[PDB]
Amino acid sequence: EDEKMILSFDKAIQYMSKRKIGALITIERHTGLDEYIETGIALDADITGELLINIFIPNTPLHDGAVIVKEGKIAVASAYLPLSESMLIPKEFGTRHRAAVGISEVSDAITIVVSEETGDVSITLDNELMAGLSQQEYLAILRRELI
Amino acid sequence: PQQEDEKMILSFDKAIQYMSKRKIGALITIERHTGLDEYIETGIALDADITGELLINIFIPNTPLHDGAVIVKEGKIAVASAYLPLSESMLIPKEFGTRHRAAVGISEVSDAITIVVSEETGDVSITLDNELMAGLSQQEYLAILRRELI
């Protein structure tokens, strides 16, 4: 039932992709994101699509940094992630994409970005940034990498 | 201690200040001795740490979470968008609003403390023991929350 979380992610992502609402969600796997989690605002909150949409409503106190998911919970919102210095990044991509890449360099975390500019959905994992994702594409990557 | 109870109050105050100034409607019910589980089961489970920032994000108008009541239970936002009973008091006009009737409603049926910000005015009210304290100062609502939550 790690699927319930994936369908909650799916609700949130569909809503924000269509409306070009920027979103940054890192999911902890084996590498502890402890030192990054303690830079954010504590939520320790149950995962629902509704909560994820509300966090990322633009011009709100929680929309800016990273949501970090750990166990079954939203641990924090507005967490600071390491920003990638990689010169291999296509530059059309913003701070959310540099956060996504930068946390993938130091961990095995899986990060979802919704572009604030285009509503383009991205997953980052193992330095690989996978932009331009459709619904069935992001749902399969997430299911594959989280069961 | 009171150190964490003072932190809860500081979270409410930040939320109240932000929404009052923007005329953002808000309803926050704080469980004390009366169980509110029958009302909590009607909402969307958050089970979240209390922060001013989360409370602001919850109540942004026309958002999934902004409607109904946040219920706080044992230092946790248990739910958003929860049902509370509407007061049917002979003392209350039709021209009172939904959140104000809910606030009066829950204070008739529980020792809960309810904060409401008027979406029409930004006026801050607290209901407690069948009593509605209307158009509160920051200093007033701080003093009421300090005396009842601590």
Numbering used by the authors:
A (entry chain AAA): 145 to 291
B (entry chain BBB): 142 to 291
Publication excerpt:
Additionally, c-di-AMP regulates the bacterial stringent response, further underscoring its significance. The synthesis of c-di-AMP is mediated by enzymes possessing a diadenylate-cyclase (DAC) domain.
However, suitable crystallization conditions for unliganded LmCdaA could not be identified. Additionally, we report the first crystal structures of apo CdaA from E. faecium (EfCdaA) and S. pneumoniae (SpCdaA), as well as atomic resolution structures of BsCdaA.
